């Protein structure tokens with residue numbers, strides 16, 4: 866009915882909270898960075914992204930499939946390599962946040978693939 870996206874965004878939020886925010890030493894990427902303590906971030910990094918704004922984006926039902934969801938989560942690893950270098954421990958930790966979020970999205974792959982058809986057929990049909 867009208868629970869397709871509510872369910873979808875529920876499964877995503879649980880990935881963030883119980884598989885990504887649980888990566889060891891993912892302390893830094895949980896919240897947005899304060900610009901008074903990092904004097905260059907918000908102008909070297911044009912598109913900031915943290916896991917708190919991803920959840921607040923999830924609760925707004927913004928991700929209608931993993932492609933738009935993976936876009937945002939891939940951006941915090943792209944942001945740490947563009948600010949800390951590809952070999953920094955921060956970047957290495959962001960690589961594992963992205964990694965745990967990839968096995969988990971294909972560990973629930975089929976079941977997720979069906980919700981994506983359901984949500985969009987509703988948006989297809991609503992137009993036609």
Ligand SMILES: C=CCCN1C(=O)[C@@H](C)N(C2CCOCC2)c2nc(Nc3ccc(C(=O)NC4CCN(C)CC4)cc3OC)ccc21
Nearest residue numbers: 892893894896897898903906914915941944945948949955
């Ligand atoms: C989107 C994700 C952005 C992820 N991200 C980055 O991508 C970049 C911007 N960083 C950098 C900033 C520069 O340091 C390397 C990490 C982040 N920093 C922090 N925050 C802190 C880092 C280190 C310390 C510290 O060690 N404190 C010291 C303790 C000991 N006393 C004597 C001195 C202070 C504290 C932090 O918050 C309070 C948070 C996030 C980042």
